[PDB]
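Dear colleague,

Following up on Tuesday's group meeting, I ran the structure prediction for the five-component complex that the binding team flagged. I've pasted the input sequences exactly as they went in, so you can double-check that nothing got truncated or mislabelled along the way. The structure tokens for the whole assembly follow below. Feel free to forward this to whoever is handling the docking comparison.

Inputs:
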Amino acid sequence: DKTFPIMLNGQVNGYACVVGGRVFKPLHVEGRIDNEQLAAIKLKKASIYDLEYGDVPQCMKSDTLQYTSDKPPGFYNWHHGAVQYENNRFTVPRGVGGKGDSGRPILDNKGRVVAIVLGGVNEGSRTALSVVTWNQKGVTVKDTPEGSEPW
Amino acid sequence: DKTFPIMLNGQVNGYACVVGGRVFKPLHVEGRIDNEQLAAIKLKKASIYDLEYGDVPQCMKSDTLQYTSDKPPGFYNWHHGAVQYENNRFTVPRGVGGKGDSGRPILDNKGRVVAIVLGGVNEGSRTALSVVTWNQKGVTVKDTPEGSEPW
Amino acid sequence: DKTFPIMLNGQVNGYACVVGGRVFKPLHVEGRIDNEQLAAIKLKKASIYDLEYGDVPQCMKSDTLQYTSDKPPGFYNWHHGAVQYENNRFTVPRGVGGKGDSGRPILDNKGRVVAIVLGGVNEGSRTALSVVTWNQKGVTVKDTPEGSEPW
Amino acid sequence: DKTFPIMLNGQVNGYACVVGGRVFKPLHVEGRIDNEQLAAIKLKKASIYDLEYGDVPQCMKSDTLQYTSDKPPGFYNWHHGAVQYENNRFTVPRGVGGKGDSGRPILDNKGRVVAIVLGGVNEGSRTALSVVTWNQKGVTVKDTPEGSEPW
Amino acid sequence: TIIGLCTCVAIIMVSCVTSVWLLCRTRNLCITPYKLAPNAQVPILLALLCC
């Protein structure tokens, strides 16, 4: 497993994942990671992208998800199913996802993580996701649909 | 419904289309929008395009027609029948169009909006349409034959 | 349709009708006509005939009732069935008519308007009706029995 | 019909009830009653019970809901199912009832209305309803369990 | 005297309006519980104090 839930009082507020060799969790997610190897890591506060991050121990380096900036139009997978991606926007059907799903990764057809979900907006029949993605040059950027509520 | 009729004296005199997540209605088509949610939004005017526009309700942002600026030579369709596109002009069989058809988009074979029809000219074999379309740079451009009467 | 009930507090207290391109409503019947297009026209008063009238909109002028001044002895009809026209007065069996049937037209065997019922008088066997009709010269006259009551 | 929805922007924002010849609707709900007869009634405010009240037209009084204060322990009926009444408190299963259900009536097994639901409490496994009912003397009282929120 | 008389009248108006307003408010709050319950006891004492 590369995804580890964050729980404050035994309930899940969000998820952490190991992408590219770094541990990611949103700033607004409170609690401790069920995996003690990740919970003990001191994380840097990237308020620029609403993410906490830190270095994976060498004993945990093998449990790393590959990431890429290559996100052509098409469909991507995540823990709740399919994700439709078009016009630099990640969208899921209404009713798929909500509060507690923050920090989950979005994976392509080769198992590479293309985005990390911070929140989303309900847009009629489909829900747009606020995600942290890499641009065409591989530089991390934050995509936030208007009115997005952190999950 | 994605194309909504406009009524002035109880009869339909044109259409307001929800394309790209925005409401597009011609300026020369006076009257209310059929949907109560689409009629309640204040609209902006673009006289250079002979159209009036405004942002859709939150729930209508997803339920919208996608548009494309690429319109290669070939055939397109609308509610009056088929549309043939050649020499940068939208030509329809004689008698197919008429008053009340303004505001209806012309669709490609993928269901994307190619052009918004505002009027036309009877050339004796086929009818040339005055449209609001997009050029090769994706910039909104009005395309009208000389002498076209607003519909 | 051709007959448009007049509603005051969500209940019908009379009926408007369109004859020969004019919308006729009783003057003593207060309320809004059960329509959207015909309800927007300003009405002229004809209190000597206890009627109000106005011009039919262009889209409704063709779908209106025709009327005739030719009233040979025999049976005429209306919404509630047969009407007897004898001794120069329109009459209906006791209890057939009553309050609320104000502005309801009386039709001949060809469906042409011969009179507009505004009230009535309850006689020994039939109820005499207060109507607006056209005399032998086709001029509008108020044809009422003695002691008629507005309906 | 015994219960009439209240429409604000085309959606139902609550429900109005007619009991014993009087019509009641939530004080905090804005919009028109979807009934031509009831929409014209000017209602009085009762801040004690968080509701507005008034009389109904003479034509509706004959078939209004029956008042009762007879509240023995047991189950009571309402629109979304059954209602449990214990310890002088009305409760329903969690997930049954929410925003927009304000003003709905609760009836016993004899078809008599016992309370008007204005709000409720979201508990772990059940919910408590904030309702206006009557005491042992037949005098109106407002029932607000701790933590009640208007619906 | 001019200032005094105006002050007296102003005090009376504010006090009488406030007194009646509270008494009218009393009747509205006192009677309303019985207006919304046609099948109620409505004690005779109520008709004497709150009306």
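The longest strand of chain C covers residues 113-122.

Cheers,
M.
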